[PDB]
């Protein structure tokens, strides 16, 4: 059987900039369930070459970016989906698992990058981003910032700043 429990019921997820990929129906209303290029009721009647399971965590206001033909900080610099993306995107509120009770600073995001990410590109570079004219040479200073920032997941925030675990299923 395809290891779907290992991805959905995993104890922790990876950051959106270093999203993990696992090379491999009824749900409930509190699950964001969007599909592109294919119908969910027809998945049992189709055979595919490879099924990739990408998992990561973002905040609520950024779930809209995990979609084809979208722009933003997460799509351009962390995780981009192609314009002809064939698959579904799944997301749920995981505030009881990745917030103050647990205290999981496992979810990062990329703030600065020289160009956009190509579809299905993962950039784990931690080189000081040059935002000015002078070379940085690995020194955090003016116009030379660290390209990774943190998520400050608090309990008081309102869904828009709460953690959502995203599982993107690609059908090749």
């Amino acid at each position: 059987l395809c290891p779907f429990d290992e991805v959905f019921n995993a104890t922790r997820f990876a950051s959106v900039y270093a999203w993990n990929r696992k090379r491999i129906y009824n749900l409930a209303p509190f699950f964001t369930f969007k599909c592109y290029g294919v119908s969910p009721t027809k998945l049992n009647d189709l055979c595919f070459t490879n099924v990739y399971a990408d998992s990561f965590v973002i905040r609520g206001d950024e779930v809209r970016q995990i979609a084809p033909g979208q722009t933003g900080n997460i799509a351009d610099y962390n995780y981009k989906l192609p314009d002809d993306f064939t698959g579904c995107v799944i997301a749920w509120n995981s505030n009881k698992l990745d917030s103050k009770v647990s205290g999981n600073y496992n979810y990062l995001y990329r703030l600065f990058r020289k160009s956009n990410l190509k579809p299905f590109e993962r950039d784990i570079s931690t080189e000081i981003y040059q935002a000015g004219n002078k070379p940085c040479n690995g020194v955090a200073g003016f116009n030379c910032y660290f390209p990774l920032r943190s998520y400050s997941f608090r309990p008081t925030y309102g869904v828009g700043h709460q953690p959502y675990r995203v599982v993107v299923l690609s059908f090749e």
Partner: nanobody
Amino acid sequence: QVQLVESGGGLVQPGGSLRLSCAASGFTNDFYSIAWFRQAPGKEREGVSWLSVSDNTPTYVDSVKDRFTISRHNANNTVYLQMNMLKPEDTAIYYCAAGRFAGRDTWPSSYDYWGQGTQVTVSS
């Protein structure tokens, strides 16, 4: 190009019924989905019903499960939201929204196409 036409609101007593309609125009094919968002006084847009058109699969939040029924009439390309056993809780501005996908979302921003809201008021 793409346009959603909403109608059907009004004033009703607690317990009555109401039929909202969302008419989708400039869609090439059946590969889109409709969602119904209601915006209570001082509340955010909240999905209550979803319809994946290509699959004809409905989804409802639990608070409206047995009272609300969503369906589609193919001829006029219109999605209907049949609201029965209306309660004062259901008073809100209702919106229908469209996106080029098959599915459902709680996030309004995930829908690039909307319609002009219709007022639903439930009191005595």
